[PDB]
Symmetry: C2
Subunit: 98 residues, 2 copies
């Protein structure tokens, strides 16, 4: 499903403002399912508590809505499990310096 | 602290759109501290997951910002503990019919 690869590439352009890294390499994407006309993503945030405006979740929704055949995007934001820097990818660790 | 009573009265005018009851009688307010120039409230939502726009949390922030002497309102939205109808007040149960 090349659509899935397309989805990841799109998400890799969405950045967390506090850490300056994309949501994929930060390890914020917990699940991703793309089955036209629907796209589903389960993700978390880098800090606890629901913000008044989930700008990151909105950016992810907008990114996935660009997928061909996708007319509805469900973005589920959860804290289960809770995120920590241990979820950073190998690439992210290179970009950081680690 | 009459300011505290003022705060509760203000919150009793903020309604959850899905249930048609105010946040206080629904049992959504977990903690409330009013110490000028700051107001703090910890609350939850009636359904899981962080919404893209936390309109309820915003309404609570706007309501408390009307308190005299209060210049900053911190609204913490959590799911710990998770909410259920068991947290409804006695009054809410009368209003419902129970
Ligand atoms: Mg972890
Ligand atoms: Mg309960």
């Amino acid at each position: 499903n090349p659509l899935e690869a397309q989805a990841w590439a799109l998400l890799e352009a969405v950045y967390d403002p506090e850490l300056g890294l994309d949501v994929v390499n930060l390890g914020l994407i917990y699940d991703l399912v793309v089955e036209p006309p629907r796209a589903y993503v389960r993700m978390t945030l880098t800090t606890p508590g629901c913000p008044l405006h989930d700008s990151l979740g909105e950016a992810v929704r907008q990114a996935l809505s660009r997928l061909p055949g996708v007319e509805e995007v469900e973005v589920e934001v959860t804290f289960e499990p809770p995120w920590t820097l241990a979820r950073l990818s190998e690439k992210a660790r290179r970009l950081l310096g680690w």
